């Protein structure tokens, strides 16, 4: 049973998932659009959108908390300097998921995830 539980395991251990979503969150803040599997994209919103929320309030504390959760000062800089101010009036929903069919190699359901004002 998994009654009321949140989170996908994605055939990973917990350390792998955290690392992967950290790398993928970075990738999305850099490029602003990435293509991934639909369940990875759906999960990425639960990581990314809190980072942008945190970026709305530019403090030293929040920068270190962002750096903790990304380990990339370049990504932290873009969150606080660009995305945080970009999304200031918007109340969540900083990303959108658009389905884009199926991967050639494994028939994985793919999707774009992008920042909404990109």
């Amino acid at each position: 049973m998994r009654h009321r539980k949140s989170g996908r395991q994605l055939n990973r251990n917990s350390s792998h998932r955290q690392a992967m979503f950290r790398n993928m969150a970075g990738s999305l803040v850099r490029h602003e659009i990435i293509k991934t599997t639909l369940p990875k994209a759906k999960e990425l919103r639960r990581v990314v959108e809190p980072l942008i929320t945190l970026a709305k309030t530019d403090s030293v504390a929040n920068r270190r908390l962002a750096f903790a959760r990304t380990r990339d000062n370049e990504i932290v800089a873009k969150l606080f300097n660009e995305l945080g101010p970009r999304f200031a009036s918007r109340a969540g929903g900083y990303t959108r998921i658009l389905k884009c069919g199926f991967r050639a190699g494994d028939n994985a359901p793919m999707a774009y995830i992008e920042l909404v004002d990109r």
């Binding site: 389905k99 884009c100 069919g101 774009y112």
Partner: protein, 54 residues
Amino acid sequence: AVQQNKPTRSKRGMRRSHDALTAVTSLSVDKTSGEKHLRHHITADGYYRGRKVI
């Protein structure tokens, strides 16, 4: 555990009565480009609900 008797071509076909693939019900027609696409998916030319997305 293994069969004591060779199953028939009849029984083979009966089991495969459920293996038939289902066609896509219908394709959706984009607002702008007029490209047919899988519903809720972006078009081949990067339109979705009339917007150039990629």
